[PDB]
Amino acid sequence: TVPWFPRTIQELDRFANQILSYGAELDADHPGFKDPVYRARRKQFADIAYNYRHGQPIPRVEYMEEEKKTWGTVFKTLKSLYKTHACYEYNHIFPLLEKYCGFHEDNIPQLEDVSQFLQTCTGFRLRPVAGLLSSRDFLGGLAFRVFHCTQYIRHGSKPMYTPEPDICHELLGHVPLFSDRSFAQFSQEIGLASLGAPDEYIEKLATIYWFTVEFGLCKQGDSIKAYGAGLLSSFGELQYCLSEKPKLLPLELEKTAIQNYTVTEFQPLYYVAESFNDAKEKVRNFAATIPRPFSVRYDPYTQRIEVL
Amino acid sequence: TVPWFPRTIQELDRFANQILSYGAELDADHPGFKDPVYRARRKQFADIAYNYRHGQPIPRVEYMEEEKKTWGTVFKTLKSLYKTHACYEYNHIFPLLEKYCGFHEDNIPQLEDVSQFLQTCTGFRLRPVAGLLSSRDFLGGLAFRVFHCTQYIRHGSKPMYTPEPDICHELLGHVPLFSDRSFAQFSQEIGLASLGAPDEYIEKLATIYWFTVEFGLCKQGDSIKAYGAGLLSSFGELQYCLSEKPKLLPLELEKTAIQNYTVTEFQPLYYVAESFNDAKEKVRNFAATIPRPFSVRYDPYTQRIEVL
Ligand SMILES: C[C@H](O)[C@H](O)[C@H]1CNc2nc(N)[nH]c(=O)c2N1
Ligand SMILES: C[C@H](O)[C@H](O)[C@H]1CNc2nc(N)[nH]c(=O)c2N1
Ligand SMILES: CCCC[C@H](N)C(=O)O
Ligand SMILES: CCCC[C@H](N)C(=O)O
Ligand SMILES: [Fe+2]
Ligand SMILES: [Fe+2]
């Protein structure tokens, strides 16, 4: 039987409060989670996301000094690395975010402003959430060009890497490409294909998504660049992904989709795509093979799903 | 050379304040215009439209007793006539407007609520204007699914008919069909085809629009119904259009487009379409023949026109 899936933008609110994690709360390598002050902050951001409702303007927040320092450190360090580590597409968009969206080392962008910016770029919009959502829900959101974005920031003790999708990851890793017309359309396409699909196909898509959109590498001329949002938000893993430590393999969905991966440490293996465009094509083609007893059509004027 | 045309929703504001009229200010048959109290009211509604800007919420207004009585008289009388005079499509939608949009004889709908309603139905939205806009501008608006709507009401001395497109005409005549998916798409299509087109094609389209969308009649089974917004808002002309007085001719664009028409009195002649659907098809086909040194594509996610 077919699982329930949202058919309207307002319906996405149904699962908005269903949060998960990568299970690092007890990780001795990630002590930031045990920090009572840190937890108290997460609680504050969670409440905002819990009381939020579709359409509403995203509440502006006043970050603490620690959080501001973390952002600046992450920002300035990554900006330096992007010059030689990030793919062409990313580097061409980043300047625009800095000039028209307030992306600076001494300023944490407010989600409301980023959402307004994305809307004018590609119609994508932000939806604040307490934390990590399931792959089915997150992907479902993409169908309506909605990016469920966190608002809290990683613990200041380890800005180089965090397992969780904090604001740094959402803004520096995902937002840039969501502002691109082609990538935006690509994102919505796979999201549309996931609606009401069997979980065995959802998890498979999630794995493919992980090895491409999240931690993917691609050839650019005779060099290798990073385009995965998880690499682009971690100055620690960004250095590593192009070093001699990790293992590299050609991107092949049949193998990639069944490949194992870590969610609390640097990836031991990465898949290299012939090009950033070939990656999108490959993932798009697989998404179209996801079987289901029906077809879907999205009407942007009413923002509703049509089941055919 | 190609005339300027809006490429974004915000750009529509450029001509928003350019108002016209059907030149009845000196008509001895329409003395309501000379009424100083009436003029003072028009001035009030005009200022609201003049200070309005894209995106902004449409200001709510408090109508006077006279205006409320006029609406009730127009509403109750037309509702009675629709049962036997209005096309099937219209009568099927009207009930919904009454139940979900506040269309009642003892209540003049606020444009903000109507706009919100239309948006959920087909994505169409209202844009308050001081009065009659040129055909080029009005049609241009349709390209972005924007209906420039008046907010003032006809003079209470003659509720049966008015040359101007008052709120009664906008709400009772146009809104109903704009809430229909198929008609909405039809409207946007012709609007898209008008952008930057030579005026000789614009005026020709306007004439066709006048004899169909505004004062068109269509066969429904073995009977004849009215679907034109101008007939549906005038209980005076609604009675007349199906009487023995007017002259009827089969809808034929080649002749219709070059046919003369009045803008201050009941139409002496009407064109009958084989069906409400055939009318849409005919007008859509003609619109597609409008020549121009370029093609246009509308992106609903960014609400911008793409010149190809
Ligand atoms: C689809 C894939 O699982 C991806 O990693 C999703 C999972 N859930 C998420 N949840 C939130 N709030 N933010 C994200 O960026 C993601 N990433
Ligand atoms: C396109 C055709 O000219 C049509 O009659 C337009 C003209 N201008 C208009 N202007 C306003 N404000 N409202 C209308 O309904 C119309 N109708
Ligand atoms: C899926 C979230 C990945 C987050 C990434 N490890 C970072 O530190 O930004
Ligand atoms: C084009 C406006 C037509 C208005 C119509 N004559 C009416 O009285 O409602
Ligand atoms: Fe991510
Ligand atoms: Fe009209």
UniProtKB/Swiss-Prot annotation, chains A, B:
Effect of residue 250 to H: In PAH deficiency; severe
Outcome reported for the amino acid change (mutating residue 35 to H): In PAH deficiency; severe
Record note on what altering residue 60 to P does: In PAH deficiency; severe
Effect of residue 27 to G: In PAH deficiency; severe
Species whose genome carries this gene: Homo sapiens (Human)
Gene: PAH
Needed cofactors: Fe(2+)
Mutagenesis / variant outcome for changing residue 226 to T: In PAH deficiency; severe
Outcome recorded upon mutating residue 291 to L: In PAH deficiency; severe
Residues of the full protein shown: 117 to 424 of 452
This protein's name: Phenylalanine-4-hydroxylase
Mutagenesis / variant outcome for changing residue 305 to S: In PAH deficiency; severe
Effect of residue 222 to Y: In PAH deficiency; severe
